[PDB]
RNA sequence: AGUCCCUCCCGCUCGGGAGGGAGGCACUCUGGGGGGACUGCCGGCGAUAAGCCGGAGGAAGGGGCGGGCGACGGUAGGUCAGUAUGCCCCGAAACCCCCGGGCUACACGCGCGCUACAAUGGGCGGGACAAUGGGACCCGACCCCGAAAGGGGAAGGGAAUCCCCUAAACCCGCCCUCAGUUCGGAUCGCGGGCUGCAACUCGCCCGCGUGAAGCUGGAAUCCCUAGUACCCGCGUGUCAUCAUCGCGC
């Protein structure tokens, strides 16, 4: 039984494939245990720790992530892994735990960049040039 | 165990130490009097930076191979301090990369793919994989979570 | 070996707490890059603290600075890659460097070149804009 | 094989030509690869509104969108004659090549 | 005396030069005047049921 | 430098940073108890998501609040310790990884030097540095008056965290002390109630002005 | 992503990984048509209406979030130097072309910005992750030459096929330890290149050499309510060369 899931964050798209194995989680082929920085590693690891050791050491996950930055890719992989785990075990209690801990693991993040505008564009939609007044 | 199971820097330093033995990889006569890119302010502070650079180039050919001088230069470029002007990104020099790749080819770790670039040969692949396996065996003791991999 | 607090290399007293790299920079006409170059050609570790230098090593640095090109330094890491008078590659330091620069400025002034005039008036010489900047008075 | 690339500034004309080609293929009985919608090309030009320099700067962004469809068919006499007999409206451009 | 806690039980409205201070009614939880209802001024975002540490429970804020 | 074990630390339980647990952390002030969030949380990083709501930061973990407050320059329109600290390109703004590392080092130093829970010490510092009263201008009739007002629990927490961060920045500014050392020293001093701490000194200043103007 | 074949590598291959072919579109993606969010439901306030506050469900709760569209008029506000145009004027000159110079001058006052006044760092080696857009006298992978700038040949691409294009901030390891310093990079000397018919007035780049104020800024004053502000880089418009700029990512 091979299960596929998707996660999206900003411009980061992650496709996660989960199957039966020993507990090998790889992000782009590189083990999750040596993810740098620790901030991104913790973001990726949180859902597995929440699920528990038993489920963690019972599935193998391979995640391919493209686009975004080192945090966007990590969060997209987090979402994909959370969804894959939830759909694989089919545990409503686990889904409820995930929802109470962080609604965003299963539900995506709609937030995107707001297009820039004139009057000192290239800085932000609302950033404006200083006015002389005299 | 392979390259993908080992941190890049810990593997690169070990590969440099091992490559110091091979006689086909020697610093050029102009190595002591050169910087590593027009964007760099001061020349290296290692006295053996040649082996580290060659190891990095070999690992790059292993991972993203086939590749070429221009793309490796893009990788090895970086930000420059232009003074009062805003900072900007520039590429790196080409002689260092070209000589490193030629020395690797002479050693037999890389080979030319015509019109595409340079790709790692089985000999170099085995060399890198052996170094990575040794490093992973060393690391497994500190980090038990890497045993299953 | 003897650890001298202050050492003399080229008529300038260098510190003893700094590495040879940054110690050699106290001499006018030698920057960090050229100091590392000279240390490497002489064969000394650039990172050794100044003061451990011996008389033989100081003498080696002496004639290295006297004629860097003939002893391995590249032809393009020199203060005067092509001298106006001799036409050779010469590296100058302190008094000789100042004399050469003054000779060049006096050359421009004597020949009445635009740069010579700008040097005399003290205004910027490399075609900058004087409307809003370079306000000294 | 024959590859046809059809591009226009009007989605309705684009779809009309695509439907005509699909009907021709269906009536001839030849298997046809569905219309591939290639990414739209958006030419954007930002221009200052004022003809002079006075006043706060304001800009307008004029955009021209061009839509592209691709179709692949297997060459046949009747099918290719019928395709060459296409209407090809004024605002649509058609290119045919053989492989 | 380390302050006295009082629970906010009703909000009157906003007040101040820039409308920063909210007038509320508070019941004293502990102290010599336990259970007394007073009207006091509050600075910052305040809800119902919040606990405010008043240094003293003598003065009462003026009406809106 | 640091051990490979610390470099590749792998948590296995749900606790703050994967190293310290808040089960034993105790908050006394009844005013501030409903607003100091101590729920289980491995990574204190919510990617905002609480600004949209009102009182939405009352459910953000205290360590995340501290990291956000530390992520700043120090001063741009207000003078800190009689100086400005306008760090333009070297500030920690938009560097949550750097703020996170600094807070981790500060907590490690606090635990090493005190022997107690760093989060408990931080809680104590907040309790000690939270002011209880202030003053403001209120207009009745046709003129203004300098009246005395109370501070709501959320404003108290905000002031305490702000003062702690500002004190750490001031201590670290152009000094041999690193940012982590400055933050640890500031937190410990605030916990110990020593007036040297910027947080405690500013709290006492606000308190005395409010008492005088009441 | 699953499945078959070939090749290679590792702990000697149980097991794991990479690439190429067949094959698939399963996921991402592109782009056409549709659904969904409607105070629709619950509690309260208001008067039973207009409506307002909170709550459940939900991706999106109250104009869903950001933009385009600027009313009758005024402002004798700006534009005849973008084109059109009344009147006045030159009409062989104020018309039309060629070289050279100027718009780039510099005791000084001002606006908006860049770099900085350091450890919330500088340097050195190594390790990661984007998007928007453009390409015919054009983009140019790839190989050889050079220390850098740059030079020679040249595949592919009128474009989801090739290229611009392996960004920086960030993370690791080492040196520096509070100092006008290994901070700061103005200002000049020498030498090597590129564009261009032409580089001195008056271009940009590169190596070595020197190292000017500046150690946080009075009165006063500016922008910003959420992926927004702040930091970090990149695309394009101008272009033979030149971006501390505008518009975007």
UniProtKB/Swiss-Prot annotation, chain A:
GO terms for cellular component: cytosolic small ribosomal subunit. GO terms for biological process: maturation of SSU-rRNA from tricistronic rRNA transcript (SSU-rRNA, 5.8S rRNA, LSU-rRNA); translation. The keyword Repeat does not apply. This is Small ribosomal subunit protein uS9. The gene is rps9. Residues 106-117 have a biased composition (Basic and acidic residues). Belongs to the universal ribosomal protein uS9 family. One of its GO terms (molecular function) is structural constituent of ribosome. HAMAP family: Ribosomal_uS9_A (MF_00532_A). It comes from Pyrococcus furiosus (strain ATCC 43587 / DSM 3638 / JCM 8422 / Vc1). Part of the 30S ribosomal subunit.
From Swiss-Prot, chain C:
The lineage of its organism: Archaea, Methanobacteriati, Methanobacteriota, Thermococci, Thermococcales. GO terms for molecular function: rRNA binding; structural constituent of ribosome. GO terms for biological process: translation. Part of the 30S ribosomal subunit. Forms a loose heterodimer with protein S19. Forms two bridges to the 50S subunit in the 70S ribosome. It comes from Pyrococcus furiosus (strain ATCC 43587 / DSM 3638 / JCM 8422 / Vc1). Belongs to the universal ribosomal protein uS13 family. The keyword Cell membrane does not apply. Keywords: Ribonucleoprotein, Ribosomal protein, RNA-binding, rRNA-binding. This is Small ribosomal subunit protein uS13. InterPro entries: Rbsml_uS13_C (IPR027437), Ribosomal_uS13 (IPR001892), Ribosomal_uS13-like_H2TH (IPR010979), Ribosomal_uS13_archaeal (IPR019977), Ribosomal_uS13_CS (IPR018269). Gene3D superfamilies: 1.10.8.50, 30s ribosomal protein s13, domain 2 (4.10.910.10). It holds the Pfam family Ribosomal_S13. Located at the top of the head of the 30S subunit, it contacts several helices of the 16S rRNA. In the 70S ribosome it contacts the 23S rRNA (bridge B1a) and protein L5 of the 50S subunit (bridge B1b), connecting the 2 subunits; these bridges are implicated in subunit movement. One of its GO terms (cellular component) is small ribosomal subunit.
Curated annotation (Swiss-Prot), chain E:
GO terms for biological process: maturation of SSU-rRNA; ribosomal small subunit assembly; translation. InterPro entries: NA-bd_OB-fold, Ribosomal_eS28, Ribosomal_eS28_CS. GO terms for cellular component: cytosolic small ribosomal subunit. This is Small ribosomal subunit protein eS28. Keywords: Ribonucleoprotein, Ribosomal protein. Gene3D superfamilies: Nucleic acid-binding proteins (2.40.50.140). It comes from Pyrococcus furiosus (strain ATCC 43587 / DSM 3638 / JCM 8422 / Vc1). GO terms for molecular function: structural constituent of ribosome. Belongs to the eukaryotic ribosomal protein eS28 family. Part of the 30S ribosomal subunit. Pfam families: Ribosomal_S28e.
Swiss-Prot record, chain F:
GO terms for molecular function: rRNA binding; structural constituent of ribosome. The keyword Ribosomal protein applies. SUPFAM superfamilies: Ribosomal protein S7 (SSF47973). One of the primary rRNA binding proteins, it binds directly to 16S rRNA where it nucleates assembly of the head domain of the 30S subunit. Is located at the subunit interface close to the decoding center. The lineage of its organism: Archaea, Methanobacteriati, Methanobacteriota, Thermococci, Thermococcales. The keyword RNA-binding applies. One of its GO terms (cellular component) is small ribosomal subunit. GO terms for biological process: translation. Keywords: Ribonucleoprotein, Ribosomal protein, RNA-binding, rRNA-binding. Part of the 30S ribosomal subunit. This is Small ribosomal subunit protein uS7. Pfam families: Ribosomal_S7. It comes from the Archaea. Belongs to the universal ribosomal protein uS7 family.
């Amino acid at each position: 039984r091979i299960i596929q899931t998707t996660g999206k964050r900003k411009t980061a798209i992650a496709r996660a494939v989960i199957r039966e194995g020993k507990g090998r989680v790889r992000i782009n082929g590189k083990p999750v245990e040596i993810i740098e920085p620790e901030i991104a590693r913790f973001t990726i690891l949180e859902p597995l720790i929440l699920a528990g050791e038993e489920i963690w050491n019972s599935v193998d996950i391979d995640v391919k992530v493209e686009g975004g930055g080192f945090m966007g890719q990590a969060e997209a992989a987090r979402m994909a892994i959370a969804r894959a785990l939830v759909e694989w075990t089919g545990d409503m209690s686990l889904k409820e735990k995930f929802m109470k801990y962080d609604r965003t693991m299963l539900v995506g993040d709609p937030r995107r960049t707001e297009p820039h505008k004139p009057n000192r564009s290239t800085k932000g939609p609302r950033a404006k040039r200083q006015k002389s007044y005299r | 165990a392979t390259v993908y199971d080992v941190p890049g820097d810990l593997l690169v330093e070990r590969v440099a130490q091992r490559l110091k033995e091979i006689p086909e990889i020697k610093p050029p006569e102009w190595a002591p009097f050169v910087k590593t890119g027009r964007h760099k302010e001061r020349l290296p502070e290692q006295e053996d930076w040649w082996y580290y650079r060659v190891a990095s180039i070999l690992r790059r050919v292993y991972l993203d191979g086939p590749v070429g001088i221009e793309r490796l230069r893009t990788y090895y470029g970086g930000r420059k301090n232009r003074g009062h002007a805003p900072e900007k990104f520039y590429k790196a020099g080409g002689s260092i990369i070209r000589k490193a790749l030629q020395q690797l080819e002479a050693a037999g770790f890389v080979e030319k793919v015509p019109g595409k670039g340079r790709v790692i040969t089985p000999k170099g692949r085995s060399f890198l994989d052996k170094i990575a396996t040794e490093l992973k065996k060393e690391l497994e003791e500190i980090i038990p979570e890497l045993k299953k991999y | 070996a003897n650890f001298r607090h202050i050492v003399r290399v080229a008529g300038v007293d260098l510190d003893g707490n700094k590495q040879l790299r940054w110690a050699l920079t106290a001499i006018k006409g030698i920057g960090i890059n050229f100091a590392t170059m000279v240390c490497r050609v002489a064969g000394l570790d650039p990172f050794m603290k100044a003061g451990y230098l011996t008389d033989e090593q100081v003498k080696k640095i002496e004639e290295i600075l006297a004629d860097p090109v003939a002893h391995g330094i590249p032809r393009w890491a020199v203060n005067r890659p092509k001298d106006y008078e001799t036409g050779r590659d010469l590296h100058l330091i302190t008094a000789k460097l100042d004399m050469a620069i003054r000779e060049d400025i006096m050359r421009l002034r004597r020949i009445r070149a635009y740069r010579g005039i700008r040097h005399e008036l003290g205004l910027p010489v490399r075609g900058q804009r004087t409307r809003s900047n370079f306000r000294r008075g | 094989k024959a590859r046809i690339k059809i591009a226009s500034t009007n989605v309705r004309s684009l779809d009309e030509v695509a439907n005509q080609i699909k009907q021709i293929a269906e009536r001839t009985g030849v298997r046809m690869s569905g219309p591939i919608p290639l990414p739209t090309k958006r030419i954007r030009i930002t221009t200052r509104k004022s003809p002079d320099g006075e006043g706060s700067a304001t800009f307008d962004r004029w955009e021209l969108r061009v839509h592209k469809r691709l179709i692949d068919i297997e060459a046949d006499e009747r099918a290719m004659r019928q395709i060459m007999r296409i209407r090809v409206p004024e605002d649509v451009t058609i290119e045919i090549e053989l492989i | 005396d380390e302050g006295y806690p009082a629970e906010v039980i009703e909000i009157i409205g906003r007040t101040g030069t820039t409308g920063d201070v909210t007038q509320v009614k508070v019941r004293i939880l502990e102290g010599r005047d336990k259970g007394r209802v007073i009207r006091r001024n509050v600075r910052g975002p305040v809800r119902i049921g919040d606990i405010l540490i008043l240094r003293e429970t003598e003065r009462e804020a003026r009406e809106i | 430098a640091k051990p490979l074990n610390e470099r590749f630390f792998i948590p296995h339980e749900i606790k703050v940073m994967g190293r310290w647990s808040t089960e034993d952390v105790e908050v006394r002030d009844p005013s501030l108890k409903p607003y100091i969030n101590l729920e289980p949380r491995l990574l204190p990083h919510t990617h905002g998501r609480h600004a949209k709501k009102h009182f939405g930061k009352a459910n953000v973990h205290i360590v995340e609040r501290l990291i956000n407050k530390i992520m700043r320059s120090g001063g741009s329109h207000y003078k800190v310790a009689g100086h400005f600290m306008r760090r333009e390109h070297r500030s920690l703004n938009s560097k949550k990884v750097k703020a996170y590392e600094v807070v981790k080092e500060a907590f490690k130093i606090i635990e090493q030097r005190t022997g107690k829970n760093p989060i408990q010490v931080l809680v104590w510092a907040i309790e000690n540095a939270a002011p209880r009263e202030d003053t403001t201008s209120v207009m009745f009739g046709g003129i203004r008056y300098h009246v005395a007002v109370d501070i709501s629990p959320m404003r108290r927490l905000d002031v305490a965290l702000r003062n702690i961060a500002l004190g750490a920045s001031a201590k670290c500014y152009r000094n041999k002390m690193s940012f982590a050392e400055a933050l640890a020293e500031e937190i410990i001093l605030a916990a110990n109630k020593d007036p040297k701490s910027y947080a405690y000194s500013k709290k006492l200043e606000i308190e005395r002005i409010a008492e005088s103007s009441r």
